[PDB]
Amino acid sequence: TLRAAVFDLDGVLALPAVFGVLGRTEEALALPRGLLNDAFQKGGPEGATTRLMKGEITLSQWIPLMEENCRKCSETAKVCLPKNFSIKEIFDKAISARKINRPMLQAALMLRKKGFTTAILTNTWLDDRAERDGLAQLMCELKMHFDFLIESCQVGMVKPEPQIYKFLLDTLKASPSEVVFLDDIGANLKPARDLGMVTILVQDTDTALKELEKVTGIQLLNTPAPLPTSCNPSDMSHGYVTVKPRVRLHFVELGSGPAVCLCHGFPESWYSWRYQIPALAQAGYRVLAMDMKGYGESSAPPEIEEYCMEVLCKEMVTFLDKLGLSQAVFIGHDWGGMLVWYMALFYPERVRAVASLNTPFIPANPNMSPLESIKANPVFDYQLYFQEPGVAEAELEQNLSRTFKSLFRASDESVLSMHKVCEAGGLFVNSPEEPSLSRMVTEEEIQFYVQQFKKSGFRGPLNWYRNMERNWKWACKSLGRKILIPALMVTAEKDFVLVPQMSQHMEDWIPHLKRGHIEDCGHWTQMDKPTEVNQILIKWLDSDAR
Amino acid sequence: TLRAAVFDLDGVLALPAVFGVLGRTEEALALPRGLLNDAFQKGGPEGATTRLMKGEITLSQWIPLMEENCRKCSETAKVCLPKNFSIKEIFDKAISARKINRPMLQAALMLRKKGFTTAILTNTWLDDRAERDGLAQLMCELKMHFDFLIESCQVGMVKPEPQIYKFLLDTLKASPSEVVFLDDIGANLKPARDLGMVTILVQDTDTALKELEKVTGIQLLNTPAPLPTSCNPSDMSHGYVTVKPRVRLHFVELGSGPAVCLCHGFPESWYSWRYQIPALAQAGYRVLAMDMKGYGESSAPPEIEEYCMEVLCKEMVTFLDKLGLSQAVFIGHDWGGMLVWYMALFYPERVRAVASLNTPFIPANPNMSPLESIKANPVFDYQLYFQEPGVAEAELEQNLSRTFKSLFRASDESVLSMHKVCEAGGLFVNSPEEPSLSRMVTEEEIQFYVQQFKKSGFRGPLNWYRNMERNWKWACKSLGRKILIPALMVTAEKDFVLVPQMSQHMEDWIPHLKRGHIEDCGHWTQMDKPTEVNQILIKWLDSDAR
Ligand SMILES: CNC(=O)NC1CCCCC1
Ligand SMILES: CNC(=O)NC1CCCCC1
C-alpha cells in the first residue's frame, strides 16, 4: 500500500521540458534530427553531461564542452552549425520558458495533504549563469511543498544509476512497493520498476494524473479549486523591534522586494494573513505581517491611551525607522484598515501605497461627538459594550475556544447579532457553549488563536475601542487634507457591520481611489475569500505599488 | 551652561536650501527678483504656505495654490510667467538636489557624543508627491542621529510663532540658557534669542561651526575623521528562523534592497559587523547580520558534526528558504569567509555574489590529510590546540573579559603569539590577567561579547575547527569546479595568520576575482579599519551585486 509519491522536475513538475527545447532548436535551425540531443548525451556515463549532473563541474564550465560536442556531431553528420550558434542562448531561453506544471503540483499537494511523504528526485546541475536566479526562484517555490528534494549534482549520483534509487528509498524510509515514481524518461523509470516501485511514464499531465489517482485511490483530477498556501507558524522568520522602552512589536517576514506591511483587525493576529503571506511573497514582495500592539508576541501595556491612533501610528513609523525602511505599502483589515488610512493621512512620505479590507475611510465629524455617531448606528452597539474596562474582557477571556469559534464564522454560519448587545448583557448570551467549527477554520487554527490570547488576553485589543474622543480630536487636524497617494478600498458584500455602502463617499477624500469588491464575503475577509483577496491585492500591487 | 543643541533642516542640516532654489529659478527664467519667494510667503500667517507648514493641507494640495499666488504676483509685477512654468517641477528638482550637510551632521554627532541632547526643529510639510520617497530617505538617515525631530506639520505650529519654541523647550526639558539654536532664517532665530537661547545665524557652515565650537567649548572644526555609525543592539530588528528541530538562527536586519548576508568569524557575533550594518543599509541594501551556529542567540548543539561545512552550508540554504529569499550576497570574515566560498561552490544559484575578508579560497589537497597541511604551517599551531574537546573551552571560558580583551587587539597592540601554543599549553599563558583595552573597542563593546558568550560558551564555536577530515572529504567533491559568480577577495596587510600571500593562487579557481587590500590592518578587519571595509564593500556591491 502506497504512502510515498516521487516526482521528476523536468517534464513532470516543470514544463516545457528543457530536453524538448533541443529538438525544437534542431527544427527551427533546420539541423539534422537528434543532432543536439545526441551532442548533449555524448560519451554517456563518461561524458560532460554526466559530470555536470553529478556536480563535478558547473553549468558555465559545461557550456563550452557542449559546444565542442555539437561541433563533433555536426562534423560526423556532414553538416554546418549556423553563423551565431550559442548553447548559452539556447539554455537561457529553455530555462526561462520552463514554468511549474500547476495541476501536477496540485496532485502532489493533495497526496501530501492525504498523508503521503512526497519528494522531488531530479537530474540537475550547479547553476552559476548570470541568470541563475530564475531557476533558484522556481526551485524555491516548488521545494516548499515537498518533504524532500534530491538533486543529482548534490548527491554525486545520477538517474538511471541504481544507487540514486536506493538513496531515494533510504531518504523516504519506505519499501519500494509503497512508492509511486513519476518520470517523463522511460529509461529513468526502468530502475524504479525493477526495484518494485509503481511507475508512471508522464507524457501528457492528464493521463499521468489518471494513472496516479487510479493507483492511489485519491481524487486528483477534477477536484475543487484548492485554498492558497497557508503558513506553518514554526517555519516562519519571526521579527522583533523595540519601538519604545516598554513596547516591542512582533512580525512574521517572508519574501524580497517592496515592503508590504500587513495590519490585522480585532481580535486577531499576524496569522489572520496566513493565506496572503506566501502569495504576496511569491508575487515579488517583502511581506511584514504584524502582531499589532496588544496582540500575540507584541507588547500589551494596560493603559488605554497606549492604544489611541496617534500613538499606534507613531510606533508604526518608529517600526519602519528601526528596520531601516523609508517606506512600506500598508494593507489593513478592520481596526488595521483604520490605522492604515491614518498612516496615509499623517505620514504619506512613509506610505508607498495604502489598501483597506472592509474598513472605509470616514473623516471625523467635527460637529458631533464620536459617542453620538456610534449611538446613531444600531450595528455599532457592541462598541458601547466594549467601553467599560473589564466587562468585555471577562466574557471574551472566560472560554477562549468559544470566543474564536463564535466570532470566526462565514456569513451563512453566524451565531452572533451585533444589535442589542448591551441590553442582552453580552456578545455570547444567545450563543452556544460549544459552537460548531466554521468551514473557514480547522480546530488547530482556532487553537493557535487560543494560545496567542493566553499571553495578554483582551485588555490591549479592547483598548483600541477606548480612545474615541482622543482619536476624534486627532482626526479633526486632518479635515482639510486629501489622500492623494495610491489607495485601494476592498468592500465585502456580507460584512453586516462594515457594510460596503459605508464606503460610498470615499472619492470625496480620496479622488484617485481604486476599488475591489468581494461577493458572498463576510467580516473575516482573508480566511473567508483568500483566493479573491490575493487576486485583488496582487493586481493592485503590481499596477500601483511596483 | 549648554547641554542642548537644536538644528534647522533647510539651509542648516541639508543643502542647498529649498528657499535658495526659488531665487535661482527667478534668475534662470529672468523673472522679477523676489517674485517666487513673494508668491511663496503670500498671505503670511493666513496664507497657503502656513497652512501647509502647520499640516492643514498636503504638498500636492498646496502646489495649485502656489501656482495661483505666482499668477497673482506676476499680474501685479506686470510680467508674464513662461509657457511651461511648473511649481511641481521646480520643487521636485529643489528637493532631489538637497543633500545632508555632512560637516553640520558631524558637529551634531560630536556634541551628542559629548553629552548634549540634540534635536531637529523644522518647518516642513506632509509630502504626498509621487517622488516623496527621496525626502523620506533623507529624513530617515538624519533623524536616527538626533534625540528629537520636531516637525511643524506634525505639531500644528510653525516658526516664528512663540509656541513652537516653548514646545521645543518642553521636549528638551531644558531652560533656554542651556540651548544653542542654529537657523539660516534670522526671523526664525529671533524668538529663540528673545527667550534667552544662544543663537547662531547659519550662512556658510564653517563660520557657524566656528561660532558653535567657541560657544560650546568642544572641538567641532578640523576634528579627526570619525568612525562610521555603529549599532545599538536594543535598537535593531532581531530575526529568528528555525532551520531544523533543534536549530534556530538569529540575525539582525536593517535596510531595503538586495539581501546581503553577513557571516562572522571565530569567536565573534553579528555585532562584529556593527560598523558595516548602517553603512550597507544606507547604501541601498537589506542587511542580514548573522549570529552563526554556536553563537549568541543562535542555537549551539554540543555535537561536533553539527559544525561541519556541509551542514552549516545546508542550514544557510534553509535559512534563505524560510525567509523566502531565492538569493543573497554572502559576505564572510574568518570562519564566515570560509563558509561563504563553500556556499558559492556548492550553492551558486543561491549566491548573488560572494566576498571574503582575510580568508582566502584554497581548495582541498586530495593528496594530503588536512592534519598534515595544518601541521606544515607554524602559525596554525593553535588549531591543533583547539582539537581536544574541553581544553580550549576551559581556558577561553575561565575569564570572558580577559578572553576578548586579549584577542580583539590592533596589529601594534598584540599580546598573543599563535606559534608554540600547544608547547606553552594555552593561548593566554604569556598574556596578562587584566589586559589593557585596545583602541579598537570600548569597555561596553567587550561586555556585549562577554554577555553573548555566557549563553553557550566556546563548545559550538570551537567545533567549527573539529571537522577537518569531514570538510576535506566534502571539499574534494568540488575539485573540478570553478567559482564563476561575482567574487571579491579582501586581504589585510597585518593579519599574521590569514596572510595576504595565502590568497595568491585564487585566480586559478576564481578567474574573474576582484580584489581589495587594507594596509595597516590586523585580523579583526571590520573594527580595525571600518571606514575602508565599508568603502571596498559598497564600491564592489554597487558594481557587481546591484
Ligand atoms: C469587530 N469589528 C470592529 O469593531 N471594527 C471596527 C474597525 C474600526 C471602525 C469601527 C469598527
Ligand atoms: C582565529 N582564526 C582562525 O582560526 N581562522 C580560520 C578560518 C578558516 C581557515 C583557517 C583559519
Side-chain angles (χ1 to χ4, degrees):
Chain A
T1 181
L2 305 171
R3 51 171 277 268
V6 184
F7 301 80
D8 182 22
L9 167 89
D10 200 66
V12 176
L13 284 167
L15 292 172
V18 168
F19 167 92
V21 170
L22 291 164
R24 251 186 285 266
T25 311
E26 279 158 19
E27 278 200 348
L29 297 176
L31 295 164
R33 295 203 171 272
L35 198 282
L36 299 199
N37 280 308
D38 186 46
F40 188 83
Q41 69 80 65
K42 208 178 187 86
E46 296 76 34
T49 299
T50 301
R51 291 189 75 210
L52 171 77
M53 299 299 198
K54 282 194 166 180
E56 299 176 28
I57 59 158
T58 72
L59 191 60
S60 296
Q61 289 180 289
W62 172 91
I63 302 294
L65 306 168
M66 175 54 23
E67 248 133 27
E68 176 52 20
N69 281 347
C70 282
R71 176 214 144 256
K72 285 206 268 268
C73 283
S74 91
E75 180 187 275
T76 312
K78 285 187 192 174
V79 295
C80 299
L81 293 147
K83 202 207 280 286
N84 289 273
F85 177 74
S86 180
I87 286 297
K88 168 107 211 299
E89 279 167 30
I90 284 154
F91 290 91
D92 287 346
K93 200 184 276 92
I95 298 153
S96 36
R98 193 176 59 173
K99 311 258 255 171
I100 290 171
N101 177 4
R102 305 280 163 188
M104 191 65 72
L105 175 59
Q106 209 193 109
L109 255 6
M110 187 73 254
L111 294 174
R112 208 193 185 201
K113 204 177 103 185
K114 291 279 168 66
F116 273 64
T117 295
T118 62
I120 303 165
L121 171 59
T122 180
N123 275 5
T124 196
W125 54 82
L126 298 171
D127 205 332
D128 57 344
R129 287 179 300 126
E131 39 290 290
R132 73 204 172 268
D133 189 45
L135 197 136
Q137 279 179 48
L138 177 94
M139 291 313 298
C140 196
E141 193 184 355
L142 259 172
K143 79 197 261 169
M144 75 172 71
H145 304 296
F146 291 81
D147 295 287
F148 303 100
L149 163 58
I150 307 162
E151 300 174 306
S152 70
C153 61
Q154 278 297 313
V155 300
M157 297 180 270
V158 97
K159 285 185 304 174
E161 305 174 333
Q163 54 185 11
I164 204 171
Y165 301 89
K166 293 276 186 175
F167 182 83
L168 171 64
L169 293 174
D170 187 65
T171 306
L172 297 167
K173 298 184 187 168
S175 52
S177 94
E178 301 179 299
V179 180
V180 214
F181 183 106
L182 296 92
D183 204 312
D184 60 325
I185 302 172
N188 295 349
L189 209 56
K190 199 167 118 160
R193 191 262 296 130
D194 171 58
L195 237 50
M197 289 192 219
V198 173
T199 61
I200 292 162
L201 177 66
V202 176
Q203 281 177 39
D204 60 301
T205 302
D206 263 290
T207 308
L209 296 186
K210 280 164 212 144
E211 285 177 43
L212 184 54
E213 68 175 355
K214 206 166 281 285
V215 83
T216 61
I218 296 152
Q219 219 225 289
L220 301 168
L221 247 2
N222 317 317
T223 228
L227 288 174
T229 310
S230 189
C231 292
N232 176 189
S234 68
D235 292 327
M236 311 305 292
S237 183
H238 289 267
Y240 307 80
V241 176
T242 298
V243 292
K244 44 188 248 196
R246 301 190 82 259
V247 191
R248 152 195 114 161
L249 298 172
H250 167 250
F251 64 101
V252 148
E253 193 171 32
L254 189 73
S256 56
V260 179
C261 184
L262 301 182
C263 304
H264 70 73
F266 176 93
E268 311 179 50
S269 168
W270 70 263
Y271 196 65
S272 284
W273 301 101
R274 61 198 178 272
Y275 295 113
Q276 284 67 56
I277 298 149
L280 315 191
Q282 208 49 58
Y285 297 92
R286 172 186 178 180
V287 177
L288 305 146
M290 310 297 302
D291 260 341
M292 300 300 282
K293 193 187 185 167
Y295 295 94
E297 301 176 61
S298 281
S299 302
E303 306 87 7
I304 287 168
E305 309 68 28
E306 278 292 293
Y307 306 86
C308 71
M309 269 304 141
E310 191 179 1
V311 346
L312 292 165
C313 285
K314 212 270 140 291
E315 282 165 14
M316 284 307 295
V317 171
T318 311
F319 176 77
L320 294 179
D321 291 331
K322 300 209 189 175
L323 256 164
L325 301 176
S326 62
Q327 283 181 343
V329 355
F330 279 85
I331 310 186
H333 168 254
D334 182 76
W335 264 109
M338 186 90 282
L339 169 298
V340 124
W341 296 120
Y342 284 87
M343 288 296 291
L345 264 176
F346 286 79
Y347 302 98
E349 93 181 20
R350 299 299 218 129
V351 187
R352 215 294 90 191
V354 56
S356 173
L357 309 180
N358 309 41
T359 313
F361 171 69
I362 303 155
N365 181 337
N367 298 308
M368 216 199 282
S369 283
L371 226 188
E372 297 185 75
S373 313
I374 272 103
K375 275 197 168 104
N377 190 358
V379 302
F380 290 171
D381 185 72
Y382 72 94
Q383 308 190 5
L384 306 172
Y385 171 68
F386 289 175
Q387 303 299 302
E388 193 48 41
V391 187
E393 287 92 326
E395 182 187 30
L396 298 156
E397 289 162 16
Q398 198 268 131
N399 186 349
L400 290 176
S401 187
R402 189 199 174 196
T403 287
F404 298 104
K405 279 173 175 190
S406 304
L407 287 167
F408 303 166
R409 302 201 145 263
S411 46
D412 59 290
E413 297 173 326
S414 287
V415 108
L416 305 188
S417 52
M418 253 67 67
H419 64 92
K420 289 156 179 178
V421 164
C422 295
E423 210 171 64
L427 247 303
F428 315 127
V429 300
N430 305 297
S431 173
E433 263 305 318
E434 291 181 319
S436 60
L437 185 71
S438 161
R439 61 197 175 89
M440 294 198 308
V441 285
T442 70
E443 184 57 43
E444 290 68 42
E445 294 172 326
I446 289 295
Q447 290 309 304
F448 175 85
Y449 286 89
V450 169
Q451 288 312 110
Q452 294 298 293
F453 280 80
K454 272 176 188 169
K455 184 204 165 183
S456 326
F458 285 81
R459 143 107 92 155
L462 286 152
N463 285 350
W464 282 69
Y465 293 95
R466 306 180 171 145
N467 290 274
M468 302 199 298
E469 201 70 25
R470 229 174 252 102
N471 293 351
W472 178 80
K473 290 190 99 142
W474 186 62
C476 282
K477 304 181 200 297
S478 74
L479 292 173
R481 306 171 196 166
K482 281 199 190 186
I483 290 172
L484 301 159
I485 70 155
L488 175 72
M489 180 66 210
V490 187
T491 58
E493 188 192 12
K494 298 175 189 185
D495 188 330
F496 305 119
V497 172
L498 300 169
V499 300
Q501 69 132 90
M502 258 182 66
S503 81
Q504 79 191 331
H505 303 306
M506 283 174 73
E507 15 286 293
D508 293 336
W509 291 86
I510 323 171
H512 325 290
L513 186 67
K514 291 202 171 181
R515 290 175 174 268
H517 181 77
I518 317 172
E519 304 268 61
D520 195 50
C521 184
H523 179 73
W524 318 96
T525 315
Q526 306 104 298
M527 57 174 130
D528 196 317
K529 292 289 175 290
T531 299
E532 25 291 285
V533 169
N534 295 354
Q535 170 264 306
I536 291 155
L537 297 178
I538 292 163
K539 181 200 150 206
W540 171 74
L541 284 168
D542 290 346
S543 70
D544 291 68
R546 296 145 187 176
Chain B
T1 181
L2 305 171
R3 51 171 277 268
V6 184
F7 301 80
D8 182 22
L9 167 89
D10 200 66
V12 176
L13 284 167
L15 292 172
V18 168
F19 167 92
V21 170
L22 291 164
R24 251 186 285 266
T25 311
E26 279 158 19
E27 278 200 348
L29 297 176
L31 295 164
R33 295 203 171 272
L35 198 282
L36 299 199
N37 280 308
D38 186 46
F40 188 83
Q41 69 80 65
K42 208 178 187 86
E46 296 76 34
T49 299
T50 301
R51 291 189 75 210
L52 171 76
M53 299 299 198
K54 282 194 166 180
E56 299 176 28
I57 59 158
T58 72
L59 191 60
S60 296
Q61 289 180 289
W62 172 91
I63 302 294
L65 306 168
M66 175 54 23
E67 248 133 27
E68 176 52 20
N69 281 347
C70 282
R71 176 214 144 256
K72 285 206 268 268
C73 283
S74 91
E75 180 187 275
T76 312
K78 285 187 192 174
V79 295
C80 299
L81 293 147
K83 202 207 280 286
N84 289 273
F85 177 74
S86 180
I87 286 297
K88 168 107 211 299
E89 279 167 30
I90 284 154
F91 290 91
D92 287 346
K93 200 184 276 92
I95 298 153
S96 36
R98 193 176 59 173
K99 311 258 255 171
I100 290 171
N101 177 4
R102 305 280 163 188
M104 191 65 72
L105 175 59
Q106 209 193 109
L109 255 6
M110 187 73 254
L111 294 174
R112 208 193 185 201
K113 204 177 103 185
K114 291 279 168 66
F116 273 64
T117 295
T118 62
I120 303 165
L121 171 59
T122 180
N123 275 5
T124 196
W125 54 82
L126 298 171
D127 205 332
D128 57 344
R129 287 179 300 126
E131 39 290 290
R132 73 204 172 268
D133 189 45
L135 197 136
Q137 279 179 48
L138 177 94
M139 291 313 298
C140 196
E141 193 184 355
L142 259 172
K143 79 197 261 169
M144 75 172 71
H145 304 296
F146 291 81
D147 295 287
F148 303 100
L149 163 58
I150 307 162
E151 300 174 306
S152 70
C153 61
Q154 278 297 313
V155 300
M157 297 180 270
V158 97
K159 285 186 304 174
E161 305 174 333
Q163 54 185 11
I164 204 171
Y165 301 89
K166 293 276 186 175
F167 182 83
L168 171 64
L169 293 174
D170 187 65
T171 306
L172 297 167
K173 298 184 187 168
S175 52
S177 94
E178 301 179 299
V179 180
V180 214
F181 183 106
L182 296 92
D183 204 312
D184 60 325
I185 302 172
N188 295 349
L189 209 56
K190 199 167 118 160
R193 191 262 296 130
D194 171 58
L195 237 50
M197 289 192 219
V198 173
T199 61
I200 292 162
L201 177 66
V202 176
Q203 281 177 39
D204 60 301
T205 302
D206 263 290
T207 308
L209 296 186
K210 280 164 212 144
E211 285 177 43
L212 184 54
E213 68 175 355
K214 206 166 281 285
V215 83
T216 61
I218 296 152
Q219 219 225 289
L220 301 168
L221 247 2
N222 317 317
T223 228
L227 288 174
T229 310
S230 189
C231 292
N232 176 189
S234 68
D235 292 327
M236 311 305 292
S237 183
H238 289 267
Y240 307 80
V241 176
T242 298
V243 292
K244 44 188 248 196
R246 301 190 82 259
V247 191
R248 152 195 114 161
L249 298 172
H250 167 250
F251 64 101
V252 148
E253 193 171 32
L254 189 73
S256 56
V260 179
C261 184
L262 301 182
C263 304
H264 70 73
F266 176 93
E268 311 179 50
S269 168
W270 70 263
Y271 196 65
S272 284
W273 301 101
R274 61 198 178 272
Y275 295 113
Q276 284 67 56
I277 298 149
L280 315 191
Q282 208 49 58
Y285 297 92
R286 172 186 178 180
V287 177
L288 305 146
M290 310 297 302
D291 260 341
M292 300 300 282
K293 193 187 185 167
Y295 295 94
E297 301 176 61
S298 281
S299 302
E303 306 87 7
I304 287 168
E305 309 68 28
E306 278 292 293
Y307 306 86
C308 71
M309 269 304 141
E310 191 179 1
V311 346
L312 292 165
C313 285
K314 212 270 140 291
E315 282 165 14
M316 284 307 295
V317 171
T318 311
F319 176 77
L320 294 179
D321 291 331
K322 300 209 189 175
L323 256 164
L325 301 176
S326 62
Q327 283 181 343
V329 355
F330 279 85
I331 310 186
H333 168 254
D334 182 76
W335 264 109
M338 186 90 282
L339 169 298
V340 124
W341 296 120
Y342 284 87
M343 288 296 291
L345 264 176
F346 286 79
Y347 302 98
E349 93 181 20
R350 299 299 218 129
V351 187
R352 215 294 90 191
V354 56
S356 173
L357 309 180
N358 309 41
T359 313
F361 171 69
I362 303 155
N365 181 337
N367 298 308
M368 216 199 282
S369 283
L371 226 188
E372 297 185 75
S373 313
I374 272 103
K375 275 197 168 104
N377 190 358
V379 302
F380 290 171
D381 185 72
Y382 72 94
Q383 308 190 5
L384 306 172
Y385 171 68
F386 289 175
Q387 303 299 302
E388 193 48 41
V391 187
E393 287 92 326
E395 182 187 30
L396 298 156
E397 289 162 16
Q398 198 268 131
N399 186 349
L400 290 176
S401 187
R402 189 199 174 196
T403 287
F404 298 104
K405 279 173 175 190
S406 304
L407 287 167
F408 303 166
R409 302 201 145 263
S411 46
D412 59 290
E413 297 173 326
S414 287
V415 108
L416 305 188
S417 52
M418 253 67 67
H419 64 92
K420 289 156 179 178
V421 164
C422 295
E423 210 171 64
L427 247 303
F428 315 127
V429 300
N430 305 297
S431 173
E433 263 305 318
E434 291 181 319
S436 60
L437 185 71
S438 161
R439 61 197 175 89
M440 294 198 308
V441 285
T442 70
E443 184 57 43
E444 290 68 42
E445 294 172 326
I446 289 295
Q447 289 309 304
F448 175 85
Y449 286 89
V450 169
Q451 288 313 110
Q452 294 298 293
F453 280 80
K454 272 176 188 169
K455 184 204 165 183
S456 326
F458 285 81
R459 143 107 92 155
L462 286 152
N463 285 350
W464 282 69
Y465 293 95
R466 306 180 171 145
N467 290 274
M468 302 199 298
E469 201 70 25
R470 229 174 252 102
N471 293 351
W472 178 80
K473 290 190 99 142
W474 186 62
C476 282
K477 304 181 200 297
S478 74
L479 292 173
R481 306 171 196 166
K482 281 199 190 186
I483 290 172
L484 301 159
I485 70 155
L488 175 72
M489 180 66 210
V490 187
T491 58
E493 188 192 12
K494 298 175 189 185
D495 188 330
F496 305 119
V497 172
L498 300 169
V499 300
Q501 69 132 90
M502 258 182 66
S503 81
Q504 79 191 331
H505 303 306
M506 283 174 73
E507 15 285 293
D508 293 336
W509 291 86
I510 323 170
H512 325 290
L513 186 67
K514 291 202 171 181
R515 290 175 174 268
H517 181 77
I518 317 172
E519 304 268 61
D520 195 50
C521 184
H523 179 73
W524 318 96
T525 315
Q526 306 104 298
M527 57 174 130
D528 196 317
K529 292 289 175 290
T531 299
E532 25 291 285
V533 169
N534 295 354
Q535 170 264 306
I536 291 155
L537 297 178
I538 292 163
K539 181 200 150 206
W540 171 74
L541 284 168
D542 290 346
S543 70
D544 291 68
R546 296 145 187 176

